[PDB]
C-alpha cells in the first residue's frame, strides 16, 4: 500500500566524532616550519545553519596531538650540535662581591676548574660564573645534574621564539568551530561552522599565568571539569590583557672555551658594572580591577555572599611554586606573591614588582634523566608580555567554613593547549544514505 | 546580466538545507573523499583512506548501483521503518535528522537490498538460459 | 580517473560515445582531417582551450539524463 | 547570515563631503560580490547611486551623480565606502549598501541571495 | 538610462482578492528584472528574482510573468501583510533605475 521503495545515495552530508592525524599549515627556530606546509592566504569557512553540535573540550583529542607533536619537534631540535659530555668536573668556586646589593649575596659563584682542548693530551685553565642554583657542594662544587645524566647545550643558531602553527584535517574528515560566545567549554553549541584549518596558535610555555594569549568576546569566562570537586584545576580567561614588563638588568658578558674538535662552550666573562636582581612589574589598578572581575564571576559559581580568598601557593618544586617562563632566551622563575594575597567580602602609578631568578640547566617538560644548558645572552634583556588568564585551584573546600581559597597552580603543559582549542572539534563523513522513492529496478 | 556575482558552493555547504535540496550537491562530497614517522603516519592515513573508499565502492557493487549516485531500487519502503509521508521527508526534514530517526533500521535494509540483487541476477540468468 | 569516468556515466569503458553534440567553434575540422591526418599529440594541441566547458556540459548532460530516467520510472 | 550595517554623519553642511562606510560581517568580500549604494527619499524615492566589483575593483556611476560620487573598500577591515562631495539640500536621504551574488554547483544553480542593511539617515542643512 | 514605469500607481483591496501590477521598459531588458517589497520602515525584501523564479522563503501566493518590456506582477491571495509597496527593478543594463512603486493599501 506504500507503494514507496527504498533509493542509495551517495556523498550525503552526515557525520559523526573521530579521531585522526592533522597536518601542518604555518606561514631557525626551536618550532621548525619547515616541515610543515606553506598557509593558504584566504581561507574559507562555512557557517552551517540549523545545525546545532555538542562539544566538550576535557576529551579533546587534538590537544594530546599538539604536546606529543611539540615534544617531537622540541627533542629534534636539540640533536645536531655539541653536548656537554667533559663539564663534569671538580669546581673551586669562591663568592662573587665587587658591586652587588644586599638582596643578590651568594647568587653568583665564580668558579675555576680543568678542561680538556683540541688535543687529548693537553689541558687548559679555565673559570666561569655560576648560579647559585646550578652547583651543589661536594670550597669543591660540582654541577647538579652530574649524578642523574649529562645536559645537551642549547644550540646558539636557534631561537625559543614561539611561532603560529595551524591544524588541518586530512581528506573525509572535517573540522567545525563553535562561534556561540559564552560557551564554557562543554554543552550544546547551536552555532557551527566548518573550516579547514585552525587559526593560529603560539606554543607559549608557561606556568601560573597564560602570555601573549587569546582573549573573550565578551566577559571573563571560568571554565572547570567539575566545578564542585577540588581536584581540578580551574580556567579563567580574562577580556582585556594586563601587560607585565619583565627584566633581567645584568650586563652579561660572553666567551666561547674549544673543548674539542669543532666543539665550543659558552661561559660567562663578567659582569660589567653593578649587579642587581631580574624582575617584573605589572600595573596595581588593572590588577585590582582583573581580581574583581574574576571574584564577581566567582561568586556566581560560588554562592553570592562568600569570602573570596586569593593566597599564596601551597608548595613543591621551584617550576610548579613559582611563575616559570622564557624571556629573551633566559628562564625566568618569578615569586607570584604580591598578587594573589587578598580578601574579597560580599557587599595611581604605582606598579607591583615580582623578584625573579635565572636558571640554566633546563628540563622543560616533567622528564627526569633530560637537561639543557642555555648559554648566556650577552647584554641587559627586557620583555613586555600580555597576561591574559589564569589557572587556580581551590583549597580545601569543605563545608565547615563558608569561606572559598583559590591558588595559584600550572605544571601540565596540556592545560595551555586547552585553553585555545576548546572551541574546535574533529568529524568524520558518512557519505551512504537510504531514503524512500518512488522507482522500482 | 550585468550587476551579480558567483560563487560556488564549498564543503559541506548543504549540511543544514532539506534532504531534497541536499540532494543535488551529492558531486562535490564525493569528489572530497579521494582528495620519518610523520611520513609514516600520513601514508598510513592515504592508505586507510583509499581502502575506505574501495569498500564503499565494492558495497555499491555488490548491490548492483555501481558507478552511480543516485540508484532507486526494487525494495519496498516498510511502513515500520518510518511513518511520515514524503512531503514532511524531503521538504520538511535535513539528512542528519533522517539518519539519526532511521540508525536502528540500516542492516535489515542492506541485507534485504542484498537479497533483492543475489534474486535479481538469479532471475536474469534464468531468463537468459533460454 | 576512474570517479571522473564514472561520473560522466562512462564507467568500465575504454571507449564511450556521448550524447552531447560538437560545437563547430571547438574545431571547424572534418572527421576526413581528423580520423585519417591527424595524431592525437596535435589534436590535443589544438584543442587544449576547450576542455573544461566541455567536462562541465558533460556533467550537466549526465545529470539531465540521471533525472529524466528517474522521472521516467516513477510512472 | 550575512549582514550589513550603515555608519556615517548625521548632518553634512552644503559645499562639504558625506563620508559614508558600510561594514559587511558573516561573508568575504574578495569573492565575486557585486555591491551597490542606494538612497531613498520622499522626493524621489528609491535612486541607484553606484557599485563596485570586489574581486576586480571595477566600479560604476550613476550619469548623473558620476561627477560626485566615489566608491571604494577596504578587504582587511571588511568594509565599502562611499565618498559624495558637493552636498546640496536634495541629497537628504536614507543611504543603504546592498549586496548581490548567486551559488553555483558546477553549471548548476543552487541559491540567489542579497542582503540589504537597516540603512542610515543623512540630512543635508547648514 | 533606461525609464522604467510602473503601473497602477495605488491600488486599494480587500484581503483575498487578486492583484495585478504591471512594469514596463523603455529599452529591452530580456528577462533581467526583480520585483521586491517594502513595508513602511522597514528596507526592501526581494520578492521575485529573473521575473519569474520565485525565492526561497517567500509564500507561493505571489507570481510574476513577462518578458522583454513588458513584466507583471500577482498576487493570488492578498493577506494583511502583503499591503506595502512593491517595486520594480532593472538590471540588465547600467544605471539601476528603480519604478516609482505601486502602493496596496487595504479597504475596509
Known amino acids: 500500500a506504500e507503494n514507496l521503495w527504498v533509493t542509495v545515495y551517495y556523498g550525503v552530508p552526515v557525520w559523526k566524532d573521530a579521531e585522526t592525524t592533522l597536518f601542518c599549515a604555518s606561514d631557525h627556530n626551536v618550532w621548525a616550519t619547515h616541515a610543515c606546509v606553506p598557509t593558504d592566504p584566504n581561507p574559507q569557512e562555512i557557517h552551517l545553519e540549523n545545525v546545532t553540535e555538542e562539544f566538550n573540550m576535557w576529551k579533546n583529542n587534538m590537544v594530546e596531538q599538539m604536546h606529543t607533536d611539540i615534544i617531537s619537534l622540541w627533542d629534534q631540535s636539540l640533536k645536531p650540535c655539541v653536548k656537554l659530555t667533559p663539564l663534569c668536573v671538580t669546581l673551586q668556586c669562591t663568592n662573587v662581591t665587587n658591586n652587588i646589593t644586599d638582596d643578590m649575596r651568594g647568587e653568583l659563584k665564580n668558579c675555576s676548574f680543568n678542561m680538556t682542548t683540541e688535543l687529548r693530551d693537553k689541558k687548559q685553565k679555565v673559570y666561569s660564573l655560576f648560579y647559585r642554583l646550578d652547583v651543589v657542594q661536594i670550597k669543591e662544587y660540582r654541577l647538579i645534574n652530574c649524578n642523574t645524566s649529562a645536559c645537551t647545550q642549547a644550540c646558539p643558531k636557534v631561537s625559543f621564539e614561539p611561532i603560529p602553527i595551524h591544524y588541518c584535517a586530512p581528506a573525509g574528515f572535517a573540522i567545525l568551530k563553535c562561534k556561540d560566545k559564552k560557551f564554557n567549554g562543554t554543552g550544546p553549541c547551536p552555532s557551527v561552522s566548518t573550516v579547514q584549518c585552525t587559526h593560529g596558535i603560539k606554543p607559549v610555555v608557561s606556568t601560573q599565568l597564560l602570555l601573549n594569549g587569546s582573549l573573550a568576546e565578551e566577559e571573563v569566562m571560568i571554565r572547570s571539569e567539575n566545578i564542585t570537586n577540588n581536584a581540578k584545576n580551574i580556567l579563567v580567561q580574562f577580556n582585556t590583557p594586563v601587560q607585565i614588563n619583565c627584566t633581567r638588568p645584568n650586563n652579561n658578558t660572553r666567551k666561547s672555551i674549544r673543548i674539542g674538535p669543532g666543539q665550543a662552550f659558552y661561559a660567562t666573562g663578567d659582569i660589567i658594572g653593578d649587579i642587581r636582581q631580574a624582575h617584573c612589574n605589572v600595573s596595581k589598578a588593572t590588577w585590582n580591577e582583573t581580581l574583581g572581575k574574576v571574584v564577581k564571576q566567582l561568586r556566581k559559581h560560588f554562592g553570592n555572599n562568600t569570602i573570596i580568598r586569593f593566597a599564596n601557593s601551597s608548595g613543591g618544586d621551584l617550576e610548579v611554586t613559582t611563575h616559570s617562563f622564557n624571556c629573551g632566551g633566559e628562564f625566568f622563575y618569578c615569586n607570584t606573591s604580591g598578587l594573589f594575597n587578598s580578601t574579597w567580602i560580599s557587599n595611581s602609578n604605582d606598579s607591583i614588582t615580582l623578584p625573579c631568578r635565572i636558571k640554566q640547566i633546563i628540563n622543560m617538560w616533567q622528564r627526569i634523566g633530560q637537561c639543557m644548558y642555555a648559554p648566556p645572552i650577552q647584554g641587559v634583556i627586557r620583555c613586555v608580555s600580555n597576561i591574559t588568564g589564569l589557572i587556580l585551584t581551590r583549597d580545601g573546600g569543605s563545608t565547615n567554613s563558608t569561606t572559598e581559597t583559590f591558588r595559584p597552580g600550572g605544571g601540565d603543559m596540556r592545560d595551555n593547549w586547552r585553553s585555545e582549542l576548546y572551541k574546535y572539534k574533529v568529524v568524520k563523513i558518512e557519505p551512504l544514505g537510504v531514503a524512500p522513492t518512488r522507482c522500482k529496478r | 546580466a550585468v550587476g551579480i556575482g558567483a560563487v560556488f558552493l564549498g564543503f559541506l555547504g548543504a549540511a543544514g538545507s532539506t534532504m531534497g535540496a541536499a540532494s543535488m550537491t551529492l558531486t562535490v562530497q564525493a569528489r572530497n573523499l579521494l582528495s620519518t614517522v610523520w611520513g609514516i603516519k600520513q601514508l598510513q592515513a592515504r592508505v586507510l583512506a583509499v581502502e575506505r573508499y574501495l569498500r564503499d565502492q565494492q558495497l555499491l557493487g555488490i548491490w548492483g548501483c555501481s558507478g552511480k549516485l543516485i540508484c532507486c531500487t526494487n525494495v519496498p519502503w516498510n511502513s515500520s521503518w518510518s511513518n511520515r509521508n514524503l512531503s514532511e521527508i524531503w521538504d520538511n526534514m535535513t539528512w542528519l535528522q533522517w539518519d539519526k530517526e532511521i540508525s536502528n533500521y540500516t542492516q535489515i535494509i542492506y541485507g534485504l537490498l542484498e537479497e533483492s540483487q543475489n534474486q535479481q541476477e538469479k532471475n536474469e540468468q534464468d531468463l537468459l538460459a533460454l | 580517473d576512474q570517479q571522473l569516468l564514472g561520473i560522466w556515466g562512462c564507467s568500465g569503458k575504454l571507449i564511450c560515445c556521448t550524447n552531447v553534440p560538437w560545437n563547430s567553434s571547438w574545431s571547424n575540422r572534418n572527421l576526413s582531417e581528423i580520423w585519417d591526418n591527424m595524431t592525437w599529440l596535435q589534436w590535443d594541441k589544438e584543442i587544449s582551450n576547450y576542455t573544461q566547458i566541455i567536462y562541465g556540459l558533460l556533467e550537466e548532460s549526465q545529470n539531465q539524463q540521471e533525472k529524466n530516467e528517474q522521472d521516467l520510472l516513477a510512472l | 547570515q550575512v549582514q550589513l550595517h550603515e555608519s556615517g554623519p548625521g548632518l553634512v553642511k552644503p559645499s562639504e563631503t558625506l563620508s559614508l562606510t558600510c561594514a559587511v560581517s558573516?561573508?568575504?568580500?574578495?569573492?565575486?560580490?557585486?555591491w551597490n549604494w542606494i538612497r531613498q527619499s520622499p522626493g524621489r524615492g528609491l535612486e541607484w547611486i553606484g557599485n563596485?566589483?570586489?574581486?576586480?575593483?571595477?566600479?560604476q556611476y550613476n550619469p548623473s551623480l558620476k561627477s560626485r560620487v566615489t566608491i571604494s573598500q577596504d578587504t582587511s577591515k571588511n568594509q565599502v565606502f562611499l565618498n559624495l562631495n558637493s552636498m546640496t539640500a536634495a541629497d537628504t536621504a536614507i543611504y543603504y549598501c546592498?549586496?548581490?551574488?548567486?551559488?553555483?554547483?558546477?553549471?548548476?544553480?543552487?541559491?540567489?541571495?542579497?542582503?540589504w542593511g537597516q540603512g542610515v539617515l543623512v540630512t543635508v542643512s547648514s | 538610462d533606461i525609464q522604467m514605469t510602473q503601473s497602477p500607481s495605488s491600488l486599494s483591496a480587500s484581503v483575498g482578492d487578486r492583484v495585478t501590477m504591471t512594469c514596463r521598459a523603455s529599452?529591452?531588458?530580456?528577462?533581467?528584472l526583480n520585483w521586491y517589497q517594502q513595508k513602511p520602515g522597514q528596507p526592501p525584501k526581494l520578492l521575485i528574482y529573473?521575473?519569474?523564479s520565485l525565492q526561497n522563503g517567500v509564500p507561493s501566493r505571489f507570481s510574476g510573468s513577462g518578458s522583454g518590456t513588458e513584466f507583471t506582477l500577482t498576487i493570488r491571495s492578498l493577506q494583511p501583510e502583503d499591503f506595502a509597496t512593491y517595486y520594480c527593478?532593472?538590471?540588465?543594463?547600467?544605471?539601476?533605475?528603480f519604478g516609482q512603486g505601486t502602493t496596496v493599501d487595504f479597504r475596509r
Open positions: 546592498a549586496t548581490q551574488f548567486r551559488t553555483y554547483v558546477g553549471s548548476h544553480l543552487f541559491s540567489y541571495s542579497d542582503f
Open positions: 558573516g561573508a568575504s568580500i574578495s569573492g565575486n560580490y557585486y
Open positions: 563596485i566589483h570586489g574581486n576586480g575593483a571595477t566600479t
Open positions: 529599452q529591452d531588458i530580456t528577462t533581467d
Open positions: 529573473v521575473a519569474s
Open positions: 527593478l532593472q538590471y540588465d543594463s547600467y544605471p539601476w533605475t
